[PDB]
RNA sequence: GCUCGCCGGAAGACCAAGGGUUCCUGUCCAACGUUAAUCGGGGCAGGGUGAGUCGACCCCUAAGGCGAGGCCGAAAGGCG
């Protein structure tokens, strides 16, 4: 999952999670097919 | 979906006339539907009509209308 940590100043802390594509992409492609099969834009069917 | 029953020179498909979104899809049931309606030709929102060769347009005229001038009529106007 690509934990990391580090510390910024002070007592804070940061932690840079920086995960890969395949969860980032898919991210993308999780969030755009579940609007097509539901939303109605004006001019077509409802979900085509 | 399965049996049942009727029309079958029509209660079947088309075109002109006429109407004017009534056609399709989603959604809604108050009103309208001679009853209840999830359904509709009802309410609302979105889509749908592609033509050198089909029709209109155009070329040509019939009945008949209009009629430059012209004839005739108190004026309007009547014929050609």
Redo the contacts with the bound molecule.
């Keep these: 999952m690509q934990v990391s940590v580090e510390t910024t100043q002070g007592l804070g802390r940061r932690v840079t999670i920086t995960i890969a594509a395949d969860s980032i992409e898919t991210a993308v492609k999780s969030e755009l097919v579940n609007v097509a099969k539901k939303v ?7 979900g085509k």
Excluded: A, N, Q, S
Excluded at 40 to 46: A, C, N, T
């Design positions: 109605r834009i004006d001019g077509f069917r409802k």
